[PDB]
Ligand binder design. Structure first.
Ligand SMILES: [Mg+2]
Ligand SMILES: [Mg+2]
Ligand SMILES: [Mg+2]
Ligand SMILES: [Mg+2]
Ligand SMILES: [Mg+2]
Ligand SMILES: [Mg+2]
Lengths: 72, 175, 112, 51
RNA sequence: CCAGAUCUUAAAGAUCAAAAGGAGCAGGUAUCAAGCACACCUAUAACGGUAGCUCAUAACGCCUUGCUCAACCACACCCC
């Protein structure tokens, strides 16, 4: 009655979980990539700031930590 | 930390006549010695409400409620120091703290003299809520730290450039 | 006799938001605006910086602002005229007596 | 004219109010008598029990 | 709120009104949520000093776009 709706979702979810199992290391690769990208855009955002403020180098003792690439 | 002495003769039996004439043993059974913890809280409450307040008779007054709630809060503090993982009492503590503070912000808006006094006496410190509660996360925390360092650099450099300007123009103007 | 300000705001009344800058009160002013669809009135808020000469202002005080003839800065167009309700110390304008909330702190019928 | 009129009006109301509050003060002292009686009775009862 | 231009006349007026402002109103998108110096004082106009300012009543972005029409706003080959 209502289960028809549930059943549908049920199927969808199953099929998707299955797929994540197959596609797993492909997915790993893509997410690691996106994390690198993220870190980079972040660095650019920072660099952009200290440059538009007229400074040449980043301020003394600034290492710009790696937040997204944080070890799992 | 205060110390409502072991021999202190519980709240209800303090004002009954000729108590001090009784022999050591009964005096001892009516002591905070043989007492519960709840009796030490009654005592602590009376004592605080006498040190801090003006009219200890009014239970109704905001100030009175703040004092009482503060006794309860210090008590949950103790309990929580012993039991780290009790989440139920952690709830009581945080909650009851928010109630205290709500009442404080209500004093400050109505009778300020008293509010001032209470904060001094119970050692409570009243902070205004921030505007904008937002979760400070890794990206924002880092970026802000950077922006602050950048700022401090820049204005320091403008200061050095003005020192150079002043020195140059002065040593020029003299000869 | 020319002293004016081009502002619409010649007199306003508002709460003191924060005192953090030297000699300058941040003040939240609030007006009623009629939401056209619902025909109802809601409070739009707007902030004003005001010049406080003696730094008289706690946060939470209701206060009255007069428009400054010559703007002190780009953001400061008003000077603080009066303190209408000091925060949590309020003297009833009707009976001239100290009150905390709805209670009289010193009764007006006990002069002596 | 109108500001003066308003002034006199506020003063009128002020006197009315002072009357009302004196009255309330009286009724209040009456209440204090009642409460003092009851609290005295229960003070006694408590003293007896504890004794 | 008006500097300025112009007309008239001695002046005063008057027409068009740049710049500067703000009671209020003003496209979509919050999967754009933080912006990163964006404030104030001092006083002499500088030296100096406080550490602020904007923002979930939508800041800061991105997309789309002439308009609320006795009219108004903008452009004038391109690089605002
Ligand atoms: Mg399906
Ligand atoms: Mg003119
Ligand atoms: Mg104009
Ligand atoms: Mg177009
Ligand atoms: Mg062009
Ligand atoms: Mg062409």
């Amino acid at each position: 009655k209502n289960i028809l709706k549930i059943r549908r979702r049920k199927m969808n979810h199953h099929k998707y979980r299955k797929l994540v199992k197959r596609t797993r290391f492909l997915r790993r690769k893509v997410r690691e990539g996106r994390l690198r990208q993220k870190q980079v855009k972040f660095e650019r955002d920072l660099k952009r700031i200290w440059q538009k403020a007229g400074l040449k180098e980043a301020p003394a003792g600034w290492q710009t930590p790696k937040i997204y690439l944080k070890n799992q | 930390q205060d110390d409502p002495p072991p021999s202190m003769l519980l709240l209800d039996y303090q004002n009954v006549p000729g108590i001090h004439k009784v022999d050591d043993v009964v005096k001892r059974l009516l002591s905070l010695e043989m007492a519960n913890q709840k009796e030490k809280l009654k005592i602590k409450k009376m004592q605080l409400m006498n040190k801090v307040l003006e009219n200890p008779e009014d239970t109704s007054s905001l100030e009175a409620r703040i004092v009482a709630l503060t006794v309860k809060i210090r008590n949950y503090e103790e309990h929580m120091q012993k039991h780290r993982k009790d989440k139920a009492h952690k709830r009581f503590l945080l909650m009851s703290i928010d109630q205290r503070k709500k009442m404080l912000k209500n004093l400050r808006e109505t009778n300020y003299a008293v509010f001032e006094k209470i904060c001094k006496e119970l050692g409570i410190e009243y902070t205004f809520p921030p505007p904008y509660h937002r979760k400070a996360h890794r990206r924002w925390v880092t970026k802000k730290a950077l922006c602050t360092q950048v700022f401090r650099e820049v204005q320091k450099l403008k200061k050095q450039k003005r020192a150079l300007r002043a020195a140059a123009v002065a040593a020029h103007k003299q000869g | 006799s020319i002293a004016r300000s081009s502002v619409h705001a010649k007199w306003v009344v508002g709460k003191v938001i924060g005192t953090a800058m030297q000699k300058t009160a941040k003040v939240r002013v609030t007006r009623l605006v009629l939401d056209p669809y619902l025909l109802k009135y809601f409070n739009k808020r707007k902030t004003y910086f005001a010049h406080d000469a003696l730094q008289q202002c706690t946060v939470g005080d209701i206060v009255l602002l007069k428009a400054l003839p010559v703007p002190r800065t780009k953001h400061v167009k008003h000077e603080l005229a009066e303190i209408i309700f000091k925060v949590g110390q309020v003297i009833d304008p009707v009976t001239g007596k100290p009150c905390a909330g709805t209670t009289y702190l010193e009764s007006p019928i006990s002069p002596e | 004219e109108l500001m003066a009129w308003n002034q006199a009006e506020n003063q009128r109301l002020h006197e009315l109010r002072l009357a009302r509050l004196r009255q309330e003060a009286l009724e209040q002292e009456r209440r204090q008598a009642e409460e003092a009686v009851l609290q005295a009775r229960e003070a006694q009862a408590w003293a007896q029990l504890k004794e």
